[PDB]
Design a protein around this nucleic acid. Structure first.
Ligand SMILES: [Mg+2]
Ligand SMILES: [Mg+2]
Ligand SMILES: [Mg+2]
Ligand SMILES: [Mg+2]
Ligand SMILES: [Mg+2]
Ligand SMILES: [Mg+2]
Ligand SMILES: [Mg+2]
Ligand SMILES: [Mg+2]
Ligand SMILES: [Mg+2]
Ligand SMILES: [Mg+2]
Ligand SMILES: [Mg+2]
Ligand SMILES: [Mg+2]
Ligand SMILES: [Mg+2]
Ligand SMILES: [Zn+2]
Ligand SMILES: [Zn+2]
Lengths: 386, 131, 136, 61, 87, 150
RNA sequence: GUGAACAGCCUCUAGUUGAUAGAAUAAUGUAGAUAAGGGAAGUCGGCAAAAUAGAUCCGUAACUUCGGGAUAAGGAUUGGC
RNA sequence: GCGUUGGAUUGUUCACCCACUAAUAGGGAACGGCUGGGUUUAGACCGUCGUGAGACAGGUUAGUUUUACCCUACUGAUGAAUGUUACCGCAAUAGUAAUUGAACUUAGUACGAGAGGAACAGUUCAUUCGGAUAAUUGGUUUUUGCGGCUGUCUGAUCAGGCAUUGCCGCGAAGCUACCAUCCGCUGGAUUAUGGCUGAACGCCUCUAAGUCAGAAUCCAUGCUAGAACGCGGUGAUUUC
RNA sequence: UGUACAACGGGGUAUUGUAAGCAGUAGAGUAGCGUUACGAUCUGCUGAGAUUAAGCCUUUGUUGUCUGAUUUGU
């Protein structure tokens, strides 16, 4: 018979199955619609999540209770050194979908991106692309023919780029390689742009700017095997219930004589691909700026790095993106930042952010000081200083 | 964090502050008002037998006398001796409003202090005589 | 967000579920208020309706005048002991939970409020701000 | 005979997932191998060209 | 309340979207394109300064390797009768 | 936006840090840390806890009265905005901080003078009182020097 | 030794060091804890936990077979030198 | 499509009251796992009947049933083979998600003797749900990290053992909370209905042929997985 | 055989709360002859001392290590 009291079901059936992701780098499932009138532009970028900190923002939002007032907000820092363009891929349209027609690589690749092709780098003879590089000799026939094929037949053009992971504090030396779609002029213009940008770097301020809404695509933090109570949010059974209280009391009481796919079960939690949208960029910081952590209100000469560095990550020595709130994934994980798939129609997409203060206290404890000079000034002279 | 401290210093089980008690003891009118309280049916001892230092009601005058002949009361009386430690002291220690802190300290040393001491002495002799 | 409240209300940590008892901060004769319902509360299985600072509740007077007791009246929460975050950048809390008796239009029965009043409640309700002597 | 056995990466050499390290069985088989090698050496056979052409285990009482 | 898929709300959103939001998007895109061109020019200048110190038919097969591999693949498919399009 | 000082230990309280408690007499108590907040709830004495600035100032560990310590106070009478006054204030703050640090260093050096004399007297008394271990030391050094020679 | 104490805890004489082991630290369990604000709204039902506790002093109602009830209840205190 | 509540009451509730709420709609998959009523056997008492053994018009109280390691289903996790190995991708199919209220302005305007009193367009918050996240606040402590306390033991100091994590205070890191913070969209085709042209039927008619709009509906966009017997592009391919 | 890796060491960043030893004229008093003896505790050397990756950051130092086994062809 019918359930006496209505209640929404536990969990979202559209995020099934709750299995481990296939790769640590989350796939970009959709790119913004291409407009042939616009100039050539990349549709996404790669970064490494460093950590989180706190800001104070001077809010300009008409109609809000916090209009012309200060708000304290949490932000996420993504280390974004420039990426390197190493290839181009052409895609044609078929009754069975998009199909890759051909790929053209640059003549010279670095060891950072060569390591992506090896499971045992230190024992290998490092022969990858050594015969491909010989096709650039005597005017580059073959390379020219494949570029002409992409110009003649492709409907989508993607550029193959890789991260400069040596600039990060990461212990990993193997770089991450990804396809980024080119949205801009004609197919020939995209191919010419990619060819002229082979072996060249693209910085993050040549893809995004301040006050823009972006999407974060990443694999969430893993948690291993988990029970139903924390995997799905079910209510705990009463105390000393037989065979356990962290369960669902009745997984089935009705005719089908099966366990339904819609019933909560214990299993893997975390390490799933996730795409969250509409994260506002608060700052695009340059790595060569001595005071990229300072504002017009806060005159302290300091960088974005907190005292002692980011916990489990290290210092920020390159360009960075400061977006508000939180993004999926944990610290030091590779993340993909995507352009918005539509023209956002909210006023928060048009707001201009002015920051009054950036927190740089230590994240390794109850940090009270923004700089070591401030800490020394407050404490005074220690026994070892004299 | 531990259960003893949690269940003693819960916010709903909080006690009156030392600076408030010092302000109560500083002025003679406040001491007279606290000594002559209206009869309240919700208080122990009908609002009578009130120790001002500890800010505590007793059920009987004999209970108040035993409380006065005790180390807990002596501990509170010793605590209520010096500067009351308001926020100005911490500000001065940080280096903020130092002149205001110095003016407050010299006012306590000159005017408020001895008057509070004389009020305490009169209260002590009154309690000794009546009890 | 209630009738008589001035404007929208941003979310505050909930401190007072149904069944809680808070002090009465006005001078109408009540000593404490016993919460029986929360105005504008949501619907969810097993979840208790809970009040926060600036919320209107339905309360019965447990201690106070006999004529004042044995009836249900609207009240406005003006102090809570559960810490809540101000958007200026601090978490804060009071010593006690306290409210005042009002009408469905948000007008005070008494003429004055004793003790501090939260800025959120005072800015939300114009009559509380008119009768408040101490606002934070 | 492998129901409810743990899995290990050392089974990938033989294209399996379930493999173990039975020390007692290995010791008994090693003793028999050493004995067979000794018998071949007594017969005069080339020790570098010997291979296990037959091995059979059945159940004792 | 009106759903996210409500027709009149979506129509009003489209009317708003054609205006200031699209204009701001276009201005941002132009600025980003200018910065990308400047970045490429700066890399060219740095490469030139570094070198200062030191100083089409698409028909047929792609290559012989591709020709051999594809012909062998099609021959194998014909021999094993595992072709998608050819009996 | 303002940097507050902890009620218990006088540490700076930056936005979004610590916790505030409001009393019945409208007195705000800001604490930089849960440590200070829990000490206050336990009603401990910051003038008796050694790790506090109140204790250090009371006991004379660091200087408390100086000209460089009278430049900061709450301004209840505002002044009209002036760009050159703001620039002058920004330079003056750095100069005042540098001078205050120099005077704090001098105060600590004056407090810690005499330690070398005390340590020397202790070392001399120990050397006088331990003759046998010194003989063992001499034997060990002589054997090591003989080993180096041969 | 502590302590009212053949209680609990630690030690001397004497006697043991036996009970398949090793490596990791998922879910669910068995045994044991802590938790902001509220305080029985949970549940058939305060089930279970929590709270109380030794000793000194003050004080102690109805009822009663006058023997009790009674450690009624309710309060103040406890270290070291 | 999406929601449909929190409680009181057992000298009975085959229900009834209080309140909140956008609303507190009806029902099926049983009635063809824990748990209280109940088939509750041996103990006991009261009532009715019986000459009696006893039975009942009845009332009260106390009373051991204890899988899973099997197959399948479900949730997650590996994996042989089609030259080998590696990187970048496509997308058949399967699943799919957002919801409701209030506020500013429109405006004390339309309307109205008055009393009263809207909405579209433009903006701002919140309820329920969902997915994350740990900068801050709170919670947690075998970090046995630092300090302290009782009893005893190592002659005392120092440094330590034991008290089934001895006890007390703080406590980073990690984990975690509507107890913390962030984020959650836009194209085609339609229903009821309103129409256009227009016969049947020399009037007429939204319908017959044809056609315009139009619902939280449908199919897509977007989101999750990726056929382990679906596929493509690309790199390297062994000197005994 | 190297912006190589590791074990230590160093510097930061954090947690706690002022180490051991020595000394004083501070210490309720008491005992012997102003002094001495005992004396909870107080004060100074001393934000000292201890811990700090085990899933913190960093590194011009010291000492070492760099290697075996199996299989795969159109
Ligand atoms: Mg969650
Ligand atoms: Mg931290
Ligand atoms: Mg329920
Ligand atoms: Mg098993
Ligand atoms: Mg609790
Ligand atoms: Mg109940
Ligand atoms: Mg219930
Ligand atoms: Mg009794
Ligand atoms: Mg029976
Ligand atoms: Mg509108
Ligand atoms: Mg001990
Ligand atoms: Mg017509
Ligand atoms: Mg597949
Ligand atoms: Zn007292
Ligand atoms: Zn503090």
């Amino acid at each position: 018979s019918h359930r006496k009291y209505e209640a929404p079901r536990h969990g979202h059936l559209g995020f099934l199955p709750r299995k481990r992701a296939a790769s640590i780098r989350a796939r970009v499932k959709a790119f913004p619609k291409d407009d042939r009138s616009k100039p050539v532009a990349l549709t996404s970028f790669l970064g490494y999540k460093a950590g989180m900190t706190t800001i104070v923002r001077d809010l300009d939002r008409p109609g809000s209770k916090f209009h012309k007032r200060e708000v304290v907000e949490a932000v996420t820092v993504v280390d974004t050194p420039p990426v390197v363009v190493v290839g181009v891929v052409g895609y044609v349209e078929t009754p069975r979908g998009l199909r890759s027609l051909t790929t053209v690589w640059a003549e010279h690749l670095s060891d950072e991106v060569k390591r992506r092709f090896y499971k045992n780098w230190y024992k290998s003879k490092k022969k990858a692309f050594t015969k491909y590089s010989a096709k650039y000799a005597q005017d580059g026939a073959g390379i020219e023919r494949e570029l002409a094929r992409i110009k003649k037949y492709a409907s989508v053009v993607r550029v193959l780029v890789h991260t400069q992971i040596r600039k990060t504090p990461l212990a990993q030396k193997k770089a991450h390689l990804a396809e980024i779609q080119l949205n801009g002029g004609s197919i020939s213009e995209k191919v010419d742009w990619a060819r002229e940008h082979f072996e060249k770097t693209v910085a993050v301020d040549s893809v995004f700017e301040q006050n823009e809404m972006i999407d974060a695509i990443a694999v969430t933090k893993g948690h291993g095997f988990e029970g139903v109570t924390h995997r799905w949010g079910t209510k705990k059974l009463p105390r000393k219930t037989h065979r356990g209280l962290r369960k669902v009391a009745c997984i089935g009481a009705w005719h089908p004589a099966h366990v339904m796919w819609s019933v909560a079960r214990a299993g893997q939690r975390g390490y799933h691909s996730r795409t969250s949208i509409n994260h506002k960029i608060y700052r695009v910081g340059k790595g060569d700026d001595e005071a990229n952590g300072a504002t017009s209100f806060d005159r302290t000469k300091k960088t974005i790095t907190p005292m002692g560095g980011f916990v489990h990550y290290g210092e920020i020595k390159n360009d960075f993106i400061m977006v508000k709130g939180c993004i999926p994934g944990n610290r030091k994980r590779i993340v993909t930042l995507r352009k918005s798939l539509y023209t956002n129609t909210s006023r928060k997409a048009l707001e201009e952010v002015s920051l009054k203060w950036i927190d740089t206290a230590s994240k390794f404890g109850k940090g009270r000081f923004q700089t070591p000079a401030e800490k020394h000034a407050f404490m005074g002279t220690l026994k070892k200083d004299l | 964090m531990g259960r003893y401290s949690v269940k003693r210093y819960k916010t709903k089980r909080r006690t009156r502050d030392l600076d408030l008690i010092y302000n109560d003891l500083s002025t003679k009118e406040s001491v007279q008002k606290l000594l002559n309280q209206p009869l309240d049916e919700t208080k122990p001892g009908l609002g009578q037998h009130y120790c001002i230092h500890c800010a505590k009601y007793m059920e009987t005058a004999i209970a108040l006398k035993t409380h006065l002949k005790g180390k807990v009361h002596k501990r509170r009386v010793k605590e209520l001796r010096g500067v009351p430690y308001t926020q100005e002291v911490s500000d001065a220690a940080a280096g903020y409003n130092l002149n205001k802190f110095l003016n407050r300290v010299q006012e306590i040393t000159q005017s408020v202090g001895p008057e509070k001491e004389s009020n305490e002495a009169l209260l002590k002799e009154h309690l000794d005589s009546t009890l | 967000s209630g009738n008589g409240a001035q404007g929208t209300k941003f979310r505050i940590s909930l401190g007072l579920p149904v069944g809680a008892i808070m002090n009465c901060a006005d001078n109408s004769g009540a000593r404490n208020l016993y919460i029986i319902a929360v105005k504008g509360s949501g619907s969810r299985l097993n979840r208790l309706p809970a009040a926060s600072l600036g919320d209107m509740v339905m309360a019965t007077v447990k201690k106070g005048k006999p004529e004042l007791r044995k009836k249900v009246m609207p009240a406005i929460v003006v102090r809570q002991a559960k810490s809540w975050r101000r958007r200026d950048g601090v978490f804060l809390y009071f010593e006690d939970n306290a409210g005042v008796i009002a009408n469905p239009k948000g007008e005070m029965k008494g003429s004055a409020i004793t003790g501090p009043v939260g800025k959120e409640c005072a800015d939300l309700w114009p009559r509380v701000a008119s009768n408040s002597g101490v606002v934070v | 005979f492998n129901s409810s056995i743990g899995r290990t990466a050392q089974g990938k050499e033989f294209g399996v997932t379930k493999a173990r390290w039975p020390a007692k069985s290995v010791k008994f088989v090693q003793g028999l191998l050493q004995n067979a090698a000794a018998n071949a050496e007594a017969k005069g056979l080339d020790a570098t060209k010997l291979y296990v052409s037959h091995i059979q285990v059945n159940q004792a009482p | 309340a009106k759903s996210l898929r409500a027709s009149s709300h979506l129509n009003a959103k489209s009317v708003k979207r054609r205006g200031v939001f699209q204009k701001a998007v276009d201005a941002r895109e132009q600025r980003i394109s200018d910065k990308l061109k400047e970045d490429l020019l700066k890399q060219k200048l740095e490469d030139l300064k570094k070198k200062e110190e030191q100083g089409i038919s698409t028909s047929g097969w792609r290559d012989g390797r591709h020709h051999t591999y594809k012909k062998a693949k099609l021959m194998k498919q014909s021999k094993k009768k595992t072709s998608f399009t050819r009996f | 936006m303002r940097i507050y000082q902890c009620h218990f230990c006088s540490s700076p309280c930056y936005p979004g840090h610590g916790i505030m408690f409001v009393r019945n007499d409208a007195k705000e108590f800001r604490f930089c840390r849960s440590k200070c907040h829990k000490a206050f709830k336990q009603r401990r004495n910051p003038r008796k806890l050694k790790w506090t600035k109140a204790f250090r100032k009371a006991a004379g560990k660091e200087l408390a009265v100086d000209s460089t310590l009278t430049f900061a106070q709450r301004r209840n009478v505002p002044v009209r905005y002036n760009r050159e006054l703001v620039a002058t204030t920004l330079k003056a703050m750095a100069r005042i901080e540098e001078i205050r640090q120099k005077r704090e260093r001098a105060f600590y050096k004056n407090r810690m003078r005499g330690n070398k004399e005390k340590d020397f007297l202790r070392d001399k008394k120990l050397v006088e009182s331990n003759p046998e271990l010194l003989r063992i030391r001499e034997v060990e050094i002589a054997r090591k020097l003989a080993k180096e020679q041969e």
